[PDB]
Amino acid sequence: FLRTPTSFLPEEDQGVFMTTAQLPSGATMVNTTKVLQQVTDYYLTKEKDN
Amino acid sequence: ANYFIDRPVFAWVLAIIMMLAGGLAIMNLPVAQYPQIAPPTITVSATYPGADAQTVEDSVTQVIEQNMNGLDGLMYMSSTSDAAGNASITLTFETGTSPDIAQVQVQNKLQLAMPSLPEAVQQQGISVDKSSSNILMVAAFISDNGSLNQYDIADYVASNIKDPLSRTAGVGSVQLFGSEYAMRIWLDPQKLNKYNLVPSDVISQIKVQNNQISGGQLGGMPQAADQQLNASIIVQTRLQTPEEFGKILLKVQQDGSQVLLRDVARVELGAEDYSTVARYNGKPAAGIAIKLAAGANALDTSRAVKEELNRLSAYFPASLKTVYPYDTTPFIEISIQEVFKTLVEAIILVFLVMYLFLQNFRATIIPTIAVPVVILGTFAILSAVGFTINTLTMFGMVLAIGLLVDDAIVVVENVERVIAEDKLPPKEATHKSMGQIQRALVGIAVVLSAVFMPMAFMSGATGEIYRQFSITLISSMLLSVFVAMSLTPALCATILKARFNTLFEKSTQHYTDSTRSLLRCTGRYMVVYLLICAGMAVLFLRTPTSFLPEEDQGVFMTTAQLPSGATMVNTTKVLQQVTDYYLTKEKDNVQSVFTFGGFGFSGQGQNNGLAFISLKPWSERVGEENSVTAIIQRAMIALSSINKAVVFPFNLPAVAELGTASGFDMELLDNGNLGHEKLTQARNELLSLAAQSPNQVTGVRPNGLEDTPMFKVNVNAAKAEAMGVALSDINQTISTAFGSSYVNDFLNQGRVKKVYVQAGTPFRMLPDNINQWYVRNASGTMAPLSAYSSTEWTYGSPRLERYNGIPSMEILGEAAAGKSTGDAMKFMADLVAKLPAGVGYSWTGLSYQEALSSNQAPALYAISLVVVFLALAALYESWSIPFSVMLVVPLGVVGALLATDLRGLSNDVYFQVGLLTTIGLSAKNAILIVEFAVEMMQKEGKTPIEAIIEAARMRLRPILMTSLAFILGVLPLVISHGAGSGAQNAVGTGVMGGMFAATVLAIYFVPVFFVVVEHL
Amino acid sequence: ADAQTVEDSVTQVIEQNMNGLDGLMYMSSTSDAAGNASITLTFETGTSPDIAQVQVQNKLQLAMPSLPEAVQQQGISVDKSSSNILMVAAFISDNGSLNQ
Amino acid sequence: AQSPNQVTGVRPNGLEDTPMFKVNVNAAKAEAMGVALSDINQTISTAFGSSYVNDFLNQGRVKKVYVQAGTPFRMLPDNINQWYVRNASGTMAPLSAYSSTEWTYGSPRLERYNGIPSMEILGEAAAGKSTGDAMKFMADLVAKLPAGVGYSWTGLSYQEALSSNQAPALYAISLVVVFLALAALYESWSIPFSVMLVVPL
Ligand SMILES: CCCCCCCCCCCCCCCCCCCC(=O)O[C@H](COC(=O)CCCCCCCCCCCCCC)COP(=O)(O)OCCN
Ligand SMILES: CCNc1cc2oc3c/c(=[NH+]\CC)c(C)cc-3c(-c3ccccc3C(=O)OCC)c2cc1C
């Protein structure tokens, strides 16, 4: 009992997850839009089966 | 029931469950000095800087009052307008109204009516607050020698202490006594005239230059393509230091020189409100009152608050010391200590009584462990029901202790007697004894529940106190009955085994032979009963009625009132005299004096002053010559040589809700359409019409201020407009010069403070100063204000009052030596009817309750008597037998009344609850005797006389044991003369004088009453 | 307004007044460079959200006068709803006639 | 970051410091030449920020009206040189005359927790380790930080800590309750003692 690890509630597969893109300070929306487009392209191309 | 005898382990498990539940409840149960007794009230406060009383009443108070409708449960509302620019509306709601709901309703109404108020009032902000006055501590902060003035300490507290507090567990609110910092700009009329300037120009330049400008963003959206830069733009920020305010540019002259604010004014970090001088033992000070939370532990909260203040004391700048006037934690500790000591003493006395009468250690063992189980279970029941721990609940527990002692004693005594005779083993003897007294126990439980019920179902402030008492008593009695039917029989079946003696035997023989051969002439004793009942009338006619005895709280209050129009110099001198007296001729008793000059109880003004005097702990002041009452009695004589003042000391009420139970409060409404002068003429007809008959009313005085001279400036609009000077400019100049002008906010060390503009002191002191101010024409030429204005002296009220939207006067007075409150109220009514037609009266504060819940206690007690008779009839299976039991209660009440009159006490809530406890216990004894007689009549075929004689002879011993234990258990309450001795004396007197007479009369009167009722 | 300007004028001013609440567990607070103040008070489990909102809006009026006139005009939203998105519904154009 | 076997993906939930543009307006020179400081501030605020003016009707709905400079005129620090302020006599003067510009630094987001400055840090536990081990490791790491900084658990971590703290008291209370129930049900103190010896099994 002393050596077993503790937790609160197990993780689940809820069918949805999130991605955060944080650009260097002072960046404009052009670069943020390009980065988010890269994220969208990766998710829709390399993971189109899921 | 009876089957718990065969299962001792079940009874032990139930007892352990009760003990665990009681411990868990004690671990987490709110504690406080008193519960919520006062009805919920909501206070609405508005500030109009520089406004008069009439101006405030016209602009703010009436507008707020006209929108205070549609509030659920509102009882009444009273409004006050001061000459300092303060409007205060207090709305008192019905008991049981949720304070948060009422506060949000009042806030919504006021906040809808907000646009109708003047912009000066709106800028300050109108504050709506819940008022409970449940102060836990009042911590004051003082400067050692001279390092910090009052405003420095007040600002440091408000900015570095109030926020660390109010987040401590248990703290619900913190209120500050003092004013924080502000940027004071003192104008100079000569310098303003030199540069052709007016206060309006200064205010406008401060608004423009002490401003926050939102620059925007370089880049920002929408943005061009290939945009790679995005930053915030900073244009201007609010000023922070007095030097920055002094460098504000007002104008640039044709020469080219710059005119700055410092060139026309003095900029200084001053105070927002200068109208209060707070001193602690002659040193500048600032205080905070912590008002606790709901469901919080007063002891733990106090410990945490002291720990946090000690931790913050390392961050104090220099010579800043914390002192703690008015700490209520010691009283709550004392109450619990007294309860625990009483329980232990009762247990020891029970042990002595049983091993003086029964002479068996195993017999004495049972109650010693039975009583604490019921005590802990009562704590658990109190927690489950949703009650807290205060003085009233603990007092109810103290009485409950004797209530449980009775049940334990009778159960063990009956088991022991059935063991002693009939040669029965303990188990079957316990079975027989429990079979003899089960129905009696149930009937006693029902009778006591019906007796204690009426106190629960009361209305007003008294209802809550009586509810605490009755709930504690009922829970304790029901749990004691359950324990006596479940755990005590099992202990008797298990633990028990198969000079004074001769004296007690002879006493029993004498008593039983007298009772048997005392039926020769009973009617004489019957008329003796009549005489006794006559006593319970005559005594009841001579009881001085009170509500709650005043206790040695260790603090009291002295009010100093200068005559009229007196500046704060005279008030400060008078309060210095008061504190010097209290610290130089009462240094052995008096520890500290906290003086507030400029603030009183009849309104804020420069001729009012208050003083809070704190006393040394009871362990250091011993004797009657060092008591609170004697101290204030000597202070009354000493603080009367102070001329040009009405210095008057008195004591804090036991509960801040109410005091002066003989006194009364009334609002003399003007009604009709008569003005203030006619109303004050009617009030002057009063205070003389009532003074003409001292035999009923004594201290009829008004709770308000009287008319004072005022300065009137009449501005000639025609001349000003013809010369080219706008009337608005003149009005703004006068208002800003003599009253303050709040401009905007600035940042002091990251905190938002106000900025004020006003004239310097030597320019706003005398009427001639009005001649020093200039106003500018449309062409730019300055001309004196004396050219268009004339000055005059008028008279006007410095404080105006309204009641339910109608002007009032608030006449408060007192009753005679003995005349009752109802007669005083019914005299003041129809004394008002002699006033000029138009006026009327209303009762507020306490009298309102006494005019709304009057014919309730007799109805409740009649219902209780009917229920008790019905329960007795159901138990005895007869309609005449219960009379012999119901005709014994007056014997219980008479002795307590006699003892209370002999000691010289009053009729307090403690006396009433002790009277009820004694009545219930005597009724229990009579019930047991009559039940035994009824059993020996139903079986064994015996006449009523012999049955009642044998029942009395059998039950003499348990009655003696219970009476001795109860009388000796409350004896230390009589002899206690230290801290908190008022309630202790009341309960000791009532119980000791009631129980002895009750048992003495009952043991002899039950047989004759039974025989007489059976005959008829 | 900038982040510091908001944090001083609005955020701290509002935050000083949220003390006397019944079952408060903890309070977070945020000031943004877009001109946003986002005070967030988490109360104990079992507390009535209606009573908590009533108390919060009661104590917000004690700091409302100290707020600027550009923040008092926009209004102060006191929401008792959850802080986590339950469902997101998006709307698009089939051929592309409508812009964003 | 140098302990990937215990915590992975530790990141701050905030924004880093950014450069800021500061415009210093010469009130003395502005008043000497005639223009008002209030007009200068209003012009800058409207041009580079915005100015909500009024409400209007669009397709039967009330919407807002905004006034702002065009996109080309609020992009670069040099754009301030293109704006003019009217003198009290009607003559327009450039805004760059009575003004200077500089670059400073500032935080774009300020966070406070329980009334004091704070920074929110999110993280995850490494493979094999659980959330409790990650929380313990992060507490140990915070214990090695410069004096004056502390840490708190909020959100899911608060509930996790509360549960892990309060479990054993619940175990003991349940054991006592079941012992007492057995003793009451079977009138003997030997059956509960013989039965409670099997709980460890
Ligand atoms: C076998 C053993 C028994 C012997 C035989 C049976 C004899 C039983 C006789 C019946 C006695 C019943 C007495 C309890 C109910 C009446 C007392 C409270 C009534 C009352 O005034 O109502 C409210 C107060 O009650 C409250 O504050 C709510 C709770 C108060 C209930 C009193 C506590 C009972 C404790 C007994 C349980 C344990 C006994 C068995 C183990 C007031 O109205 P409000 O609430 O609006 O006032 C405003 C505050 N909110
Ligand atoms: C150190 C002595 N102990 C006390 C000192 C006090 O000083 C006070 C000074 C004040 N002005 C300073 C600018 C104001 C406005 C209220 C004060 C109260 C007070 C607060 C709430 C409700 C009623 C009162 C109250 O005055 O009644 C007396 C119990 C007060 C109360 C106590 C116990």
Residue numbers in the entry:
A (entry chain A): 554 to 603
B (entry chain C): 2 to 499, 513 to 1030
C (entry chain A): 52 to 151
D (entry chain A): 705 to 905
Q: Any passages from the paper?
A:
Bacteria can resist antibiotics and toxic substances within demanding ecological settings, such as low oxygen, extreme acid, and during nutrient starvation. MdtEF, a proton motive force-driven efflux pump from the resistance-nodulation-cell division (RND) superfamily, is upregulated in these conditions but its molecular mechanism is unknown. Whereas we discover distinct transmembrane state transitions within MdtF, which create a more engaged proton relay network, altered drug transport allostery and an acid-responsive increase in efflux efficiency. Physiologically, this provides means of xenobiotic and metabolite disposal within remodelled cell membranes that presage encounters with acid stresses, as endured in the gastrointestinal tract.
Here, we report cryo-electron microscopy structures of Escherichia coli multidrug transporter MdtF within native-lipid nanodiscs, including a single-point mutant with an altered multidrug phenotype and associated substrate-bound form. We reveal that drug binding domain and channel conformational plasticity likely governs promiscuous substrate specificity, analogous to its closely related, constitutively expressed counterpart, AcrB.
